[PDB]
């Protein structure tokens, strides 16, 4: 009768489990099919069903609730929750108010909107047209809050009954969906100019008061103010940048206030974990979520999601790895700070035209490789929208779901299945934490800039971080493809103690960066850390006043060169260095002085290493990016930097195309390309050869006790077995190579022992992906 | 001693041949590998080898020439041309002046630009930085033209000697490369404002004389002028749109003049055909290329290229089908008018991080399928750039080429090999002309507007044809995926006779549309034609004055809604029809009056059919797009329109996922998704069932005399054999059906017969891709 957790896994009656689920939205699947679909789900090793509860659906007119299929069968929420329970599945419930979910108004009733348009959010140019999707609402408007609570006041009682804590199915409740201000936060001046915000001592004026003095504001916006009253909210980029960022963190704070209201209400009914998906549809900005929730002490379980393709074929190849490494990194950060378990509540299984299984497996199998071992697949069970409730897809709700509308199982099941068998068979993997010696240091203000797409005329460096940092050619993709799996740290949040857990810290820099954070960086270097910083050094603070503590600490004078915005005008230069010949780079390089030179464009020095105190700093005046080629000069440059600052990796590979993430007693191996790849692999004291025929991921055990047998290594993935027996998975080979400390091979189930190399290492030969070994 | 052609294939000595080639840039490969690499190319079945000739490379200093490899081995053009002949391969040669090719200045020498800056192009704001790639040059500037001819005069002798017609290897010579004003034509006011243009009686000024009066300009630009001299070239969009199109067409004209000059100089030394790659790097604007080259009677062979992924993984799936169908289409259109053979001179095989063989194949095989049966694979052989001449990639020039730097052969060789064997073995298929009963009506001015991304405040309809027409959800993608493989006709250039070769014509339509084209359409309908016209009718002529000819002829009052530019503010509407339920559409749907109503949104009628004269016209007030799902409601609406206007297809399929392209005695079956697909296909009187396991293409002979045996059908690709003997290829199954009118299957080489059904049909079972049947 209790749902608890540790840092790592949710517990039911002290029996700790791995949440492995799929989404079945009962309001979108015919009622008589529900039974079959939950059994099928269960048949793929899913233990958890997730579903939204749509306010829209269950209160289709003000006052008329129907949770028992009276008016319409698909309104039979009670039914569904008893059926799932009867079938042995656990339930994660998402009562909204907003469910997004490609559904009419994201779950908000028309009647609320059409008889209280005072709650509707407003642009600087007045109201939004009624034509538009997810009609934006002013969150802290009271009318909307009175009616939001009236929905929760009917539904949470029903959820109360079905809690696992009171002999039911439900193991977590989730607050709203991806609260992004109705997806208008990405445009700085779209929202919200509703007269409840905006007016003299409005929301706004009160938020300025609580966070700043006129001080402060007079330093930030470069203007004197008699009282907070005079500060109107910004309507364009002509206004000072620190103002626009305040307007950003203010809208974020408003979301957090709306979120807190819902949580506190939920807390009245529910004694199981309370959860939240991807606040703000951003990442760096979780900085604010973390501080907010530490300020107010709200036990909110931060849950995440992973989407890479919409209305388009599923496109997940090496290109997307910088982002995935980034997102899981920053997720890991805040989730290990809040000390709750990592969980992807929406892992993409629908809404791409096709989802090809090997690309899907690259996403799904890296999430556990990247520390997110609790997983839910959305949308699992294809459906169909009731009439009058359509939005984004019209009739259909089956764009290539794992199980379709007519019950068909689509290809992407094959990897959901096995990732399940793997997660459930290796508790030791799940109870690892992710290592990282290297980390990327995020400065949050840079997110906004890149989100909004705006660079001040007077800035030297581009804000297109999507190109240069996150995307297919981004630095972070280069780092992933260079076998440098990284943690992410938030530079403002993190203490120096946390920074000094890392050997290397990579920082991408723009024109501005706070004194405190430039002061932190100088200390990390001074203490024996190793910094890489790129493509310029900062020379301004958070409020755009001169500040060159970092520049001056290093004794590094960095040329001023304006990065070009016009695509045709962006140069290609070729960077030479020790051991590397003509590594291409995009956009202006900056001469860099002081320190021993390590990088050149002709005569011009564009890179330098500087030691101060126990450690060092590498400063590169160019945008180091991912570019693939036989010469492979970018990946070499990375290795070359790592040697210069003396960070040896945990894994070594004879072939750079082998991507490898160490998880202590497992070595996750990745071929991210659909191509034969082979070569040797030194890790953890051992070494072995591997051949990977196609694209995919293997979790390879090393120096570990599993199923009663001590293994040195095994070139395949453990997905179960029994006492002195191991069931292996190698779909990327005809062959596997096993080594063992103090046992022998009695026999093989799905193949035979084709070799001995001796000292107790054997080459197995299996004609299927799966096979067993008796020890 | 001759190189001729019919409209289909080039002929050597009356022997006709399929040009199946790769690029080897001798200047970028170590000379002492040229032999092995060329051998390898021949062992893949390539009969042609293409190469640039880099002015740059061979003329390192003004007047210092080298083509024998005195200074640097890779300068040995002569020795390469001899080695190519010695080993059997015919050469295609591209001497420039500009070669693109990711190479310093795109082939132009540094000394020319340094010692003569007066030839450099200018923006409205002045000179371009020297940093910039492919430093742009004014094409007609005498000094440039002088030095271009001095390069042509010191290379075209060497080409003369090795022409096929003088016992050599060179079967053609190409003008420049992709002449696009140095990739500055994409930007309307970037280029060219050099003083040789622009000046009173500049180029410009004389062009405006050639092509217009003060009539005309007085009407077009909406202002009285004294002379041509007062008219400045436009520098922004707040000049009137007709002027910006004239500026667009004038830049195109200059390129055509530059081309004519280079052509006129080539014709002096050469009798082999004179090729030109993708003029203007535009498509619709080949209208201007065709008009120009007819007016001047230049025997120019218009070649093409296909590229879809740069510095990123190769991504060719169903999403690019709209584009491919459109490109091949409009390439078929112009190259059948000019009555020259269709050739893809650059068919992508490098510059993508990985090129997966199934996606590569889907492109390489759809090119023949879509009528382009001579093919060259750029870049074939992986090289290294000589220090100094680096540009786009730095050192490297082996970004996943079919043959690498160390001699390795990569996975996209497998599809090149077989497509060779296919084209060569099947001259019938090559001598087909591509059917299309349905066609798309391109209106060239719309291209310019899409390319610039500028829509007038005043216009109702968006210019994002990339999204709504060409792209991954583009209407053209919908048509392709709905098995309506279409032709493309230029609405301005084509005559009413031509238009009536087609049962259905689709036209995407903005606010403006010429009287002479709006008159061509109202006649097409009345003469017994069928028009689908979307998403609004025009109300303005080519000069933005009122002209509602079409709109008054049909008797159709279409709404004035204004399409929204802001992503967030674009609506999702749900379109109903007879049989189709809640089809989704983005952006404003327009009420449509007159005709019988075929498509509804609530009570508002957003589509209609009009019968007028002998024929009819569908007019949809919405943007019909490609969206994939279970319900498949978009593809069904397409069927539902072809029913209405009575266009039966040539192929029928029990699974809509099977993509079929009819080529008379062959059927191109294509599975564009990597999934298991199967169904029954009726075509050409015969029916059968087919299973395709992965992504790829088959060419299936249906009711035809091949290698002396009468087939009804055969569920595999014919790739060679001998007498009463066919060699087959079916990489998408373990099994292939084979029917035959007259004969019986004697033996089976790479398999066995597994069945008979009766009346002479036989199910083969082959454990490999390839097999052979003897009759």
Coordinates of C-alpha atoms in Angstrom, one line a residue, chain B residues 10 93-94 96 152 172-180 255-256 258-260 262-263 266 273-280 286 289-290 292-293 298-305 331 335 338 340 343 345:
Chain B
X10 CA 24.1 8.9 -77.3
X93 CA 35.0 16.6 -69.6
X94 CA 34.1 19.8 -67.7
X96 CA 34.9 25.4 -66.6
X152 CA 39.6 28.0 -73.0
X172 CA 31.1 15.4 -74.5
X173 CA 32.2 18.8 -73.0
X174 CA 30.1 20.7 -70.4
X175 CA 29.8 24.4 -69.9
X176 CA 31.0 25.8 -66.5
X177 CA 29.1 24.1 -63.6
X178 CA 25.6 24.8 -62.4
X179 CA 25.8 28.6 -63.5
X180 CA 23.9 30.4 -60.7
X255 CA 24.1 33.9 -67.3
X256 CA 22.5 32.8 -70.6
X258 CA 27.9 34.0 -70.4
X259 CA 26.7 30.5 -71.5
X260 CA 26.2 31.5 -75.1
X262 CA 31.3 29.8 -73.7
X263 CA 29.2 27.7 -76.1
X266 CA 33.6 25.6 -77.6
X273 CA 27.7 17.4 -78.0
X274 CA 27.9 20.4 -75.7
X275 CA 26.3 19.9 -72.3
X276 CA 25.2 22.2 -69.5
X277 CA 24.5 21.3 -65.9
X278 CA 21.4 22.8 -64.1
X279 CA 21.4 26.4 -65.2
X280 CA 20.6 28.9 -62.5
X286 CA 14.6 26.6 -67.3
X289 CA 16.9 28.7 -70.6
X290 CA 14.7 27.1 -73.2
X292 CA 16.8 31.8 -74.8
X293 CA 18.4 28.8 -76.4
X298 CA 22.3 26.7 -79.6
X299 CA 22.6 22.9 -79.8
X300 CA 23.0 22.5 -76.0
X301 CA 22.4 19.3 -74.2
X302 CA 20.6 20.1 -70.8
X303 CA 22.0 17.6 -68.2
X304 CA 21.0 17.5 -64.5
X305 CA 22.0 16.3 -61.0
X331 CA 13.6 17.9 -66.6
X335 CA 14.8 17.9 -72.4
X338 CA 15.1 20.3 -77.0
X340 CA 18.4 15.7 -76.5
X343 CA 21.5 12.5 -68.2
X345 CA 25.8 14.1 -64.5

